[PDB]
Design a binder for this molecule. Sequence first.
Ligand code: HEM
Ligand code: HEM
Ligand code: HEM
Ligand code: HEM
Lengths: 141, 141, 142, 142
Amino acid sequence: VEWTDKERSIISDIFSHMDYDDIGPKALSRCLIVYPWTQRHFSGNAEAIIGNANVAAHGIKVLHGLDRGVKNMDNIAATYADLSTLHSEKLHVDPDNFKLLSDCITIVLAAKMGHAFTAETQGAFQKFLAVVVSALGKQYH
Amino acid sequence: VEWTDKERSIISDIFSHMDYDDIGPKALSRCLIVYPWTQRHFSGNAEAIIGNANVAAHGIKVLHGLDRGVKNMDNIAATYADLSTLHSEKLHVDPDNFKLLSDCITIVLAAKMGHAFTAETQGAFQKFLAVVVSALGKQYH
Amino acid sequence: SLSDKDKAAVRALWSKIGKSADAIGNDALSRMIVVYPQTKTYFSHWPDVTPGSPHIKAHGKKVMGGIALAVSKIDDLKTGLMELSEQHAYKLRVDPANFKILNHCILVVISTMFPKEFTPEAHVSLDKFLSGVALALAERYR
Amino acid sequence: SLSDKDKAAVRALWSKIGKSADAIGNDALSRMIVVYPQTKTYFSHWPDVTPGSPHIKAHGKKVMGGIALAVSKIDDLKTGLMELSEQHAYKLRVDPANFKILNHCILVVISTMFPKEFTPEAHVSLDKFLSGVALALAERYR
Ligand code: HEM
Ligand code: HEM
Ligand code: HEM
Ligand code: HEM
């Protein structure tokens, strides 16, 4: 991707106003309920999942993980090379799972931001997640 | 992608032994019958489609189009930038269509090559088409 | 397939948000066109196709009315949406890959408008429902 | 959904290629593991998981026997494949994204083995059938 200055500003703004501790756990628990086959990773009901500290911890890690991408928007695939290997090689996370998660991150953000999550905002945010998802799932390009 | 020498050799071999005039029309007519919504592009029955000279002409163009990618495997996204614009901007081809087509190219090749289309062969061939499909559909990475 | 649990969840959610169907459609349609530019071409016959557009607004009512129809026909989406499938396949020739795109935009809009009601449990059943709606709209395609 | 035309085409094709079901499965399973490495993990309990493997061969017979079951249950895939859905969802915990991958490998193998029989018209109906099979296997997932 060739980022426009407006995209960089939008992504920077979203991340600076996001409360990771709130958004992270929500996005991951939402992902575990909507695509329950992802639950296998955090077992090492819905109510249970939502309050599970292990789920919360990784959800927060995911958001901090996106931050290094936000820090260097032009070196994303390189930035996530190691995390990609970890999730496939050691964790056996199916590469399709990154896209499912992300949609859940976008949906939880949309709920937090409400009408401030404009179309232009959604476009920039989803484009940034797409690039990260490609690097994690190691897509051919 | 970082091509291995074996991948380059496989792709080079496949393309040097493929009869474009036969494979091209077959792949496109197969695509038009299996995902018939793609027919809209060549109307400007199955039997009719298979013998349609317009369909055949573009199927052959597709294969010659892949050849420039084969010629510079390390500059594929750049190579297809213009063709990408043409298909989206001027032709309104849905980006999902490149993946459908491609699967049809792979399937027609598999039929031609028979058991010579080994798993390793299929892997190298599909990986090359994936990279081309990403450049044509202009995927975020 | 939709279970009785899924059907009940979708009816309960629609009961709650249905009042805002027009606004949901205008917003979902606006987003689609902007975020997935390959979709703009289907609406190019309209004088104005931007988020603010009066055409977008009018059609958004029709899109969510089709979703409301889907909710009433939840027990048999194939039969209930057959005429809309025919229309999209034959008359409008809308590439079927786009149904899941509009569905995602509808989920995003419902989330921005009803954060309280759109819980993860409402989301799983509505997503299975929208997948069923997309498959039903794809009925006449091949 | 599968039309009577689709059902008849799938039964006619299976009538023709069914004799080679074991070989089709061994080959499809081999390809999957090699071309989509994320799938290898589900079979890591086997001593040998390479194209040549005796485990691959034995299981390939079981995979195409499930496809043969699907052909016999073509009128109601959901009910016919419910037990296999339960098994993949709950006991094996196979990520459902992989069903379409094996399906593509099965199409590739049938094409290498029966170029004459696997015409574009056989392909469209078999592809709609395999999509239905994947959706049925996904029944117990959520
Ligand atoms: C945007 C996507 C993701 C990012 C940025 C992300 C980030 C991370 C990070 C920072 C860690 C700690 C890694 C380390 O210790 O070096 C981790 C661990 C892990 N990830 Fe993810 N992850 C993502 C998606 C997923 C998905 C979709 C799953 C599974 C469905 C998953 C499952 C795991 C598990 C099991 C661990 C180990 C447990 C833990 O550390 O909490 N991750 N991930
Ligand atoms: C690997 C994918 C493809 C390649 C390499 C390819 C290549 C080409 C080439 C070389 C041309 C002539 C372009 C020019 O005049 O500058 C062309 C034209 C065109 N393409 Fe494609 N194409 C592909 C996929 C598709 C798909 C999937 C569709 C539609 C379903 C499609 C529809 C068209 C149409 C309508 C034309 C104009 C008619 C013609 O020139 O035959 N193409 N394409
Ligand atoms: C949730 C899925 C969708 C629903 C329920 C839906 C519903 C509708 C309804 C009710 C109509 C009016 C039909 C009539 O006149 O009887 C229609 C027309 C139309 N739809 Fe859809 N649709 C969906 C998805 C799509 C998508 C994905 C696109 C394109 C990307 C699309 C493009 C159109 C267009 C262009 C028209 C005609 C607009 C006009 O000329 O005024 N539809 N749709
Ligand atoms: C066309 C779709 C598929 C069919 C019809 C199918 C069919 C079968 C059948 C008949 C069995 C034996 C079940 C029993 O013991 O009663 C089974 C087991 C199993 N399947 Fe599938 N399956 C499919 C897709 C998948 C995919 C996509 C994967 C993984 C990527 C998978 C992984 C497994 C594994 C690991 C076992 C157990 C193997 C063992 O321990 O021996 N299956 N499947």
